[PDB]
Write a protein that binds this ligand. Structure first.
Ligand code: SFG
Length: 261
């Protein structure tokens, strides 16, 4: 069993009450207060991200794990956190987001953050059946967690099948969620894909400990398997601390306002 695949068994053996304490222990979390007011009051201009995803992407872009440029395609865009953040960035010219939508799946939110005129999101789109289109930057943030690691595995491999046909079109900047990176079939697929399109895996500290998500990003490199194990070790280390402490809070990204040419 991989170290992740021990962390999962452990995770599942936790009481509802220990679960709650653990999921946010020592993680980075952002101050979303003002964002749900804007949300209540429909303030589309306050600069408040529509979701937690904006901060996660910003963590990876600021460290040059991905450098969005040209036309961005955002698969699984949900409310649009990644799309609106990308729209603020200088290299970016056009952002095309796609998301399933429907009941129980997030609908895109219309906002007037900086570069919003550059954003087009289409809900009602199941990306597993959408044909690929040219792009310079590929995002994908899809992966429904699950107590079963085999379910998470099949979900992950299906995503990594779908993404390959987009990467075949040339974008050299990408950022793709890997929900279940500790399963062997997923590690094997990533090495194959890494041989073909490069990049490597990074653990965003804003992720909750209740999931092992990692992001295959074009600006990382190095051994896929060991990067996975290193994060596995962190998550296990946090399950075994005796004094809990809570998350480390930080301010959210301000996405500003206004149109871009
Ligand atoms: N087959 C699918 N096709 C399109 N969207 C999907 C599909 N499966 C799941 N999704 C959506 O993918 C989105 C995943 C979210 N984590 C995206 C959040 C987004 N990155 C943000 O920052 O706001 C969910 O909103 C799903 O509804």
């Amino acid at each position: 069993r991989t170290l992740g695949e021990q962390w999962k068994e452990k995770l599942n053996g936790l009481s509802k009450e220990d679960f709650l304490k653990y999921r946010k222990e020592a993680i980075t979390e952002v101050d979303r207060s003002a964002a749900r007011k804007a949300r209540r009051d429909g303030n589309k201009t306050g600069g408040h991200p529509v979701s937690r995803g904006s901060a996660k992407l910003r963590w990876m872009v600021e460290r040059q794990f991905v450098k969005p440029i040209g036309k961005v395609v955002d698969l699984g865009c949900g409310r649009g956190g990644w799309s609106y953040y990308a729209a603020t960035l200088k290299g970016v010219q056009e952002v095309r987001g796609y998301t399933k939508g429907g009941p129980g799946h997030e609908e895109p939110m219309l906002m007037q953050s900086y570069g919003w005129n550059l954003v087009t999101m289409k809900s009602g789109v199941d990306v597993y059946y959408k044909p690929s289109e040219p792009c310079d930057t590929l995002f994908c943030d899809i992966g429904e967690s699950s107590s079963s690691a085999e379910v998470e595995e099949q979900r992950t491999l299906r995503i990594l099948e779908m993404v390959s046909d987009w990467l075949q079109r040339g974008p050299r900047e990408f950022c793709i969620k890997v929900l279940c990176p500790y399963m062997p079939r997923v590690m094997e697929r990533l090495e194959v894909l890494q041989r073909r399109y490069g990049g490597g895996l990074v653990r965003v500290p804003l992720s909750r400990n209740s999931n092992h998500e990692m992001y295959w990003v074009s600006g990382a490199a190095g051994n896929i398997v060991h990067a996975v194990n290193m994060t596995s070790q962190v998550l296990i280390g946090r399950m075994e601390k005796r004094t809990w402490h809570g998350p480390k809070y930080e301010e959210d990204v301000n996405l500003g306002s206004g149109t871009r040419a």
